[PDB]
Each structure stands twice: as C-alpha cells, then as structure tokens.
C-alpha cells in the first residue's frame, strides 16, 4: 500500500508494520514523513530509527559542557547532573564544588558527585546506604560487584528497581557478591516476583529452608493463580508436604505445575471446552490485518450483550480464532479453550507434531491469522520477517513469495512445521524447541552447553527452568509446554508429564 492510503487507517501495530515496510525500501519522501509521527502507534525501535533518518525550558543548559558547567545557573546545573555519564566526565574539583552547592537541596545528587571522585563509586554509595544511588550506579554499569551487609540488602527491596535487578543477576548468573549477599534478605521484606527470585537464588546456594520461606511468601502474595501455583510447587519440592501438592492439584489455573500435580495425585484432567461451529465461513476477511485490529478493539469494549452479538457474528469455522477469543472474554477467562482451527492443513502430520504446532500457535497468536507483534513477527505462527523470507525465498523458492504469505494459515502451519522440524532435529525436547522458537537456537545451544543447566541435580530439571537466562523465553517455554500436554491429551496421544521432565536431563 502507498503511504497516503495507509494514513487513512487507524493507528495500530498493523499500520506501523506497513509504515515500516515503506521506510525499509526508502519509499517515503520528506514531505510525506513530516506528519508521520502522529500516524505511528508504537514509536519505539526499528521504526523510530528508520524515521529519524528524515524541551526549550532546558535547551540552554545543554550548551554547557564538562569544562563550563560552573558558569551555568543553578537550574541548568541541576538539569545536566541528572546524567551519570555527565557526572563521570567532570573532574573532582568541579564535582566537589557542586556537591557543596547541592548538599541541602539534592542530597542524593551530592552523594553521587562525591562517589565519582573515588576509584569505586559503588563502594562509596554502599557505605552511605544510598539506595537510590545504588540502582542508578547499577544501571550505569553492571560491572560493580561487592559484598553487601544485612542492613543494606534489606533496604534494597523498597525500591521499584529491585525486582529486575534481582531477576537479572540471578537468571544471568552475574554479580556473585551481590547474589550471595541477598541470602540475608528477610522474607518479611519481599513479596511476589522479588520473593520468588530470592527463593530461586537461595536454592542455587542450597539454602532450602530459606528458599522455602521465600517461595511461601511469594505464594501468599502473588495475584495470579499461575504464579501462585509455581511458588507452591517449589514449596512442595522442598518439604514434600501433602497439603501443598493437594492445593496445587485443585488449581483452576491450567499450567505445567497444576497439570503435574494432577498426574501425581490421580486427579482427573481439567475440562477443556469444545468449539465446532456449524457454519464454514462468512464475509469477514481473516487475511485483512486492519480488520483484525478494528474488531479486537470492538471486542475489548463490549459488554455481555455486545459479546453475545459478536459471538453469533463470528460463529464460523473460518472465524474460529475470533469466536474463541470472544468466548474467552464472555466467560471471564475461567474456561479452557484449546481450539484446532484450519485443521485440514495439519491432519496428516503425526499427532505429536500436531500437538507441538498447535501448542506454539496457541501461545504465539491465539490462532489469529493476521497477528502482529511489537517486533513485527507475523501471522498465526509469529515468524520474524527475516526467517519467513529465508524459508520462503532461499530454502523453498516459492514463486512470488512475500512475507505477508505468513498471514495465510496454510503457509503459517507449513513454515511452522518446517522450522519446528529443524529445531527438533537438533534439540529433541518440546521445551527446548519452544525456547529456540522464541529466543533462537543460538541462545538455546549456549544454555544447554553449560555444565550447570539441565544436568542431573536434586531439584532438576525444575531449577534449570527457572534459570533460563532470557525472561521472555523462560516464561514462553512453560506456557508452550502446558499447551503441548493439553493438545496431546485432546488428540488421544497423552504422555506422562513425568516422562517429559525426565527427558530434560542430559
Ligand atoms: C519463528 C521466529 O521467527 N522466531 C524468531 C524469534 O521470533 C519471536 C519473537 C517473538 C516476539 O515477537 N516477541 C514480542 C511478543 S509481544 O508483541 O510483546 O506480545 N515471537 C516470535 C516467535 O516466538 O525471534 C528470535 C530473536 O530474534 C529469533 O532468534 S534468532 O534466530 O537467533 O534471531 C527467532 O528465530
């Protein structure tokens, strides 16, 4: 589509995507580009960069430099010193004068100014127990590491940056002195994700009673049933209390931990809804990405009555993904929908391969054929354009191939099969295939080559699943693995969950 036609659509990821495609080919002119920021839905990343190839209150403050900062007025000094890179570029003469100037009004700035006079700014800030400075320095450089006392570490969780700081250094196995120091955080001082990660940290040093206390505090504070189940599972792995396994087995959340608990207690498999519309198709275009962005907003805004009307409108085989998306919401996410749309395209693969394709598709797109992610992964199977083109143009040599072919379910399922087959041939387990599908086989190979990941051990393979070093893939693998178990069950191709976990140990 030309830019002027595209400008008439409502702002969305689909519109951004097509704006990006034009900017990619150098097909937008300067005149056209000028009003284009009001036409972008998410002005972040690749689209922001490609476009830029085409606060006056504080502007004067940016003429000053490291060499002239003391000539500036108090406001401008204050503004420039919000940058740690700038503070580090000063000399100690100027940092010491500015620290005096700002002592009473901006005491946290004063601390950093003086900190940067020393050879280790972090040690200086740690001595002060300046928590705000601690996180700014961590963001400045991940290289700082030192042993922290009990008083300091127990103040770190009262900052919004603690959760990602902890998660990051734990799952990446970085900053050993910080990590070891966090064994002294009192579980009363943490909750939710922070408590969970500290539980994971404690397990890596084999502090299992401490871990149990952290996981218990997570279980008591998490708002999502899925996260609560994950914490309860660790409570059970550590102390083996029958009531934890029982509670987990009765979860209405369908996830790997509730599923495994049901297997272990002989609890029946959860109820899965069965959708099979009588009508084959209607006039809605399931290959039109703009139409999906529009209807998605309509469904979000609908009350119960409006959802009933929409359900009737999309009650077809061709529109099944939208029908299921409507019913999820009408039932307030309390029912379990595991659809198998456009099934004629996968019916001749074996049932395990079907389950893996369905499991991936369900997590990626909820089967919406024109699904578009924030990084412009495309279609039901959420292929990145570079991969879709590689498979389509190089490997399969499809005549007149375009990346938008990924919006057609026959293509999405066929490419998904092709790529999953390559990943499986190298990784075996559906979990490892999932990690590699989302995060790339490069990161997955490097992770599995580690001597401390997915090898024999007391709490393995469950501990390794918590230490997958990229958050998105860590979560994605767990969700896809649950979906794979359910689809295998639905296809009468059930596998013992315990066998799946045993197959992860190398
Ligand atoms: C099927 C596919 O295209 N997979 C690619 C994946 O896409 C991911 C990206 C992800 C995505 O779009 N994430 C954002 C999701 S959302 O908009 O925040 O909901 N979904 C897609 C399939 O899982 O991105 C990674 C990393 O680039 C690639 O690894 S690489 O080979 O080492 O480059 C990998 O090949």
Short mmCIF file of N, CA, C and O and ligand atoms in Angstrom, two decimals, residues 13 364 372-377 381-388 419 436-443 472 476, ligand 1:
data_model
loop_
_atom_site.label_atom_id
_atom_site.label_comp_id
_atom_site.label_asym_id
_atom_site.label_seq_id
_atom_site.Cartn_x
_atom_site.Cartn_y
_atom_site.Cartn_z
N UNK A 13 -0.57 -1.70 15.40
CA UNK A 13 0.65 -2.40 15.01
C UNK A 13 0.65 -2.77 13.52
O UNK A 13 1.70 -2.81 12.91
N UNK A 364 1.54 -18.14 20.63
CA UNK A 364 2.01 -17.06 19.78
C UNK A 364 0.96 -16.03 19.43
O UNK A 364 1.20 -14.85 19.54
N UNK A 372 0.18 -9.59 14.74
CA UNK A 372 1.42 -8.84 14.50
C UNK A 372 1.96 -8.41 15.86
O UNK A 372 1.28 -7.71 16.60
N UNK A 373 3.18 -8.83 16.19
CA UNK A 373 3.81 -8.47 17.45
C UNK A 373 4.45 -7.10 17.38
O UNK A 373 4.59 -6.50 16.31
N UNK A 374 4.91 -6.64 18.54
CA UNK A 374 5.67 -5.39 18.62
C UNK A 374 7.00 -5.36 17.86
O UNK A 374 7.47 -4.27 17.54
N UNK A 375 7.57 -6.51 17.56
CA UNK A 375 8.75 -6.59 16.69
C UNK A 375 8.38 -7.01 15.25
O UNK A 375 9.24 -7.37 14.47
N UNK A 376 7.09 -6.96 14.92
CA UNK A 376 6.54 -7.35 13.60
C UNK A 376 6.73 -8.81 13.21
O UNK A 376 6.89 -9.11 12.04
N UNK A 377 6.69 -9.71 14.20
CA UNK A 377 6.51 -11.13 13.91
C UNK A 377 5.08 -11.30 13.41
O UNK A 377 4.17 -10.61 13.89
N UNK A 381 1.76 -18.30 13.40
CA UNK A 381 2.99 -18.87 13.93
C UNK A 381 4.06 -17.84 14.31
O UNK A 381 5.16 -18.22 14.79
N UNK A 382 3.74 -16.55 14.14
CA UNK A 382 4.61 -15.44 14.56
C UNK A 382 6.07 -15.59 14.08
O UNK A 382 7.02 -15.57 14.86
N UNK A 383 6.22 -15.71 12.77
CA UNK A 383 7.54 -15.64 12.15
C UNK A 383 8.04 -14.22 12.03
O UNK A 383 7.30 -13.33 11.56
N UNK A 384 9.30 -14.02 12.42
CA UNK A 384 10.00 -12.79 12.11
C UNK A 384 10.19 -12.72 10.58
O UNK A 384 10.45 -13.76 9.95
N UNK A 385 10.00 -11.53 9.98
CA UNK A 385 10.18 -11.40 8.53
C UNK A 385 11.48 -12.02 7.98
O UNK A 385 11.44 -12.67 6.92
N UNK A 386 12.60 -11.83 8.67
CA UNK A 386 13.86 -12.37 8.17
C UNK A 386 13.82 -13.90 8.03
O UNK A 386 14.35 -14.45 7.07
N UNK A 387 13.16 -14.59 8.97
CA UNK A 387 13.07 -16.04 8.93
C UNK A 387 12.08 -16.52 7.87
O UNK A 387 12.32 -17.51 7.18
N UNK A 388 10.95 -15.84 7.77
CA UNK A 388 9.93 -16.16 6.77
C UNK A 388 10.51 -16.04 5.35
O UNK A 388 10.26 -16.90 4.50
N UNK A 419 10.21 -25.31 10.26
CA UNK A 419 11.11 -24.77 11.25
C UNK A 419 11.15 -25.59 12.54
O UNK A 419 12.23 -25.81 13.09
N UNK A 436 13.95 -22.26 21.69
CA UNK A 436 14.63 -21.91 20.44
C UNK A 436 13.72 -21.21 19.41
O UNK A 436 14.17 -20.34 18.67
N UNK A 437 12.43 -21.60 19.39
CA UNK A 437 11.44 -20.97 18.54
C UNK A 437 11.30 -19.49 18.89
O UNK A 437 11.30 -18.66 17.99
N UNK A 438 11.20 -19.19 20.19
CA UNK A 438 11.05 -17.82 20.70
C UNK A 438 12.36 -17.00 20.74
O UNK A 438 12.39 -15.82 20.35
N UNK A 439 13.42 -17.63 21.22
CA UNK A 439 14.66 -16.94 21.53
C UNK A 439 15.83 -17.20 20.60
O UNK A 439 16.85 -16.53 20.70
N UNK A 440 15.68 -18.17 19.70
CA UNK A 440 16.74 -18.51 18.77
C UNK A 440 17.51 -19.73 19.24
O UNK A 440 17.69 -19.96 20.45
N UNK A 441 17.96 -20.52 18.29
CA UNK A 441 18.72 -21.75 18.63
C UNK A 441 20.12 -21.42 19.19
O UNK A 441 20.64 -22.17 20.02
N UNK A 442 20.69 -20.30 18.75
CA UNK A 442 21.98 -19.81 19.31
C UNK A 442 21.97 -19.73 20.82
O UNK A 442 22.80 -20.37 21.48
N UNK A 443 21.01 -19.00 21.40
CA UNK A 443 20.94 -18.86 22.87
C UNK A 443 20.65 -20.20 23.55
O UNK A 443 21.18 -20.48 24.64
N UNK A 472 11.66 -13.63 28.54
CA UNK A 472 10.56 -13.92 27.61
C UNK A 472 10.54 -15.41 27.26
O UNK A 472 9.48 -16.03 27.23
N UNK A 476 7.78 -18.23 28.14
CA UNK A 476 7.20 -18.81 26.92
C UNK A 476 7.28 -20.36 26.95
O UNK A 476 6.32 -21.01 26.64
C1 LIG B 1 9.70 -18.08 14.47
C2 LIG B 1 10.70 -16.94 14.55
O1 LIG B 1 10.76 -16.09 13.66
N1 LIG B 1 11.47 -16.97 15.64
C3 LIG B 1 12.46 -15.89 15.90
C4 LIG B 1 12.02 -15.18 17.10
O2 LIG B 1 10.74 -14.58 16.87
C5 LIG B 1 9.95 -14.46 18.06
C6 LIG B 1 9.91 -13.04 18.55
C7 LIG B 1 8.71 -13.07 19.45
C8 LIG B 1 8.05 -11.66 19.59
O3 LIG B 1 7.54 -11.09 18.62
N2 LIG B 1 8.04 -11.17 20.84
C9 LIG B 1 7.34 -9.96 21.24
C10 LIG B 1 5.94 -10.50 21.61
S1 LIG B 1 4.74 -9.23 22.15
O4 LIG B 1 4.34 -8.35 20.96
O5 LIG B 1 5.40 -8.45 23.30
O6 LIG B 1 3.48 -9.92 22.64
N3 LIG B 1 7.78 -14.06 18.82
C11 LIG B 1 8.49 -14.76 17.74
C12 LIG B 1 8.27 -16.27 17.73
O7 LIG B 1 8.26 -16.68 19.13
O8 LIG B 1 12.91 -14.12 17.36
C13 LIG B 1 14.20 -14.61 17.78
C14 LIG B 1 15.04 -13.43 18.31
O9 LIG B 1 15.15 -12.55 17.21
C15 LIG B 1 14.81 -15.37 16.61
O10 LIG B 1 16.01 -15.98 17.00
S2 LIG B 1 17.28 -15.83 16.13
O11 LIG B 1 17.23 -16.82 15.00
O12 LIG B 1 18.52 -16.07 16.99
O13 LIG B 1 17.32 -14.45 15.55
C16 LIG B 1 13.85 -16.48 16.19
O14 LIG B 1 14.33 -17.13 15.01
#
